[PDB]
């Protein structure tokens, strides 16, 4: 086969050629020595990688036999202390993570997550640190299409004015005047290096004049006004010549907000990458972002302003980018050993995306720049416990050697999405104490893990109910305490999950405020538009101060984290039960087809209620596991799931385009088969992970196109 041989490794040609002719030029790193690091690191670190995975299965099997007899909560706690699932909590400590960008240490705002494989969205996500508030309010349902405000083909003046009014109220709410509002405003000036606003009768200044930050144009009549609030910036574009500002009282054309302050470029649950050719598309895009020459169009440059002091300064016009690698589980045949075994895709992701990130700290090569303090930011998903965190640090050290970068350059975003990590979260941070820039609650995976771990105990509650169970409410608060009790304020981000309802922007703006009220300096949005709307929340809420007043407090006991979410012993009705089955089969079929048939890892799949859900691979983990739990405890038969899948499939076909229908040949469509395997084999998948079945089935389709 077409694999370059280097030591004990057979490296697929497209990978070797890409690492050699694209990623290595500009790193000051010698090719034969790089590849030697790859061989050496893989040889030394593979065993421990393997041992950790075996360790998970040990615990998961021990926990199964326990639930097959034993309904106590204090012997269950003691039992997990025996098997080394629950480890002692260390003495309180402070993190020591140096060389971190201001976007992570102090600034608090929304955080975008994007499939790196999609060169188009990754482009937008990087340019989404700035976004029109007008566009955002106008397009979505934030301003109700209620009274002549309906979106049409031509511009709606009724809807446009309502948008303006809304932005007017936000300006009053964030950067208040000394007397009056921005609604009565008529013009802007910066006299004496101070912002003064014209009113119809008088002229007021800024009640808090420090919130004035700059401007562009003439000082006595600018082309723009720059404001700050809660770290985030605000731009009032002044142009009475544009078709908005002509009918506008102050000439305001638009309001621009600092939206996606950071973006996570994603190699894991939002992308489909099952072979060596796939990983290179991802790497080639990640490369583009780091040189700053990726195009479809280009990436944005810095934004120049004029200080109130008189000088001229600059602001980053791109979102500080993370990259998220895959977890420890999977292996990818982008590299095989001499015996043919697939090499761990985690280790490859650390090496390659690590290597590629070198361009991010430098201008030609490539013209544009990412980090300013010299840091690489890797999100690690799906870790189970302190030792799996330690291993990843050691890997970063080993990878750092190979690339010849100072130790602790590769910072680590820790993700709380596995039950064993949650209950040992202080230990985990401690293992990453010199690297960690990020913790985060990922309910979707966390719920996936929660179901599978206690799946021998009994029938589990519906997935709609899971978001308000005491384990998850504990979990959320528990995550913030540990980060804050570790010194996270002014040092690292404390973050929370993602808004999936991509078109319910009204609900989001109404609901998502709870997360920075819970003291989190970052929360996950699906779109550049959702980032802009979600910026509003950080202006309204002083997250720095919320963080402060939570300090020291212990809101979540270990008794409340092990509260398993069973149901109250046969308390449903056949109509409900089949509603849950049909609904879970809906979110599974809808997602798998795009994933298997087209290799798409994240898409708005209309649910059973026609609600556009931005579903990624984690949502597949909840639905499949839940159904598997209801299978295992006799809530439904195997014929139900089958009758349901057959029932829900042609409706999925009706929600979809060079597209390949599942119905009516359910046994000839690889998508359908993959679907019901995730359910029927679901209880047997490790920690409920969907990847194995998802990958073989995607490769078995690539292959079916000879
Ligand atoms: Mg997850």
Author numbering: 2 to 71, 76 to 301, 312 to 379, 382 to 673, 677 to 726
Copy the relevant paper text:
Based on our hypothesis that the active site loop opens to allow for product/substrate exchange, we made a G459A mutant as Gly-459 underwent the largest main chain movement upon lid opening. The additional methyl group of the alanine side chain likely restricted the movement as anticipated, and the mutant showed 20% activity when tested in the enzyme assay. The crystal produced after preincubation with substrates belonged to the P43212 space group and diffracted to 2.7 Å resolution. The crystal structure was particularly interesting because it showed that Asp-633 had drawn closer to the Mg2+, making interactions with the oxygens of malate carboxylate (dOD1-O5 = 2.8 Å) and hydroxyl (dOD2-O3 = 2.5 Å). This hydroxyl is also within hydrogen bond distance to Arg-339 (dO-Nω = 3.0 Å). Asp-633 movement places the conformation of the CoA binding loop in a position between “out” and “in,” 1 Å from each as measured at Glu-632 Cα. The Mg2+ is in a pyramidal coordination with two water molecules, Glu-434, Asp-462, and one malate carboxylate oxygen. The other oxygen on the malate carboxylate is making contact with the mutated Ala-459 side chain with van der Waals interactions (3.1 Å) as shown in Fig. 5. Asp-633 then moves toward Mg2+ and displaces malate so that the malate carboxylate group is within hydrogen bonding distance of both the Asp-633 and Arg-339 side chains (as observed in the malate-bound structure of the catalytically hindered G459A GlcB mutant), possibly serving as a hydrogen relay to restore the Asp-633 and Arg-339 protonation states for the next round.
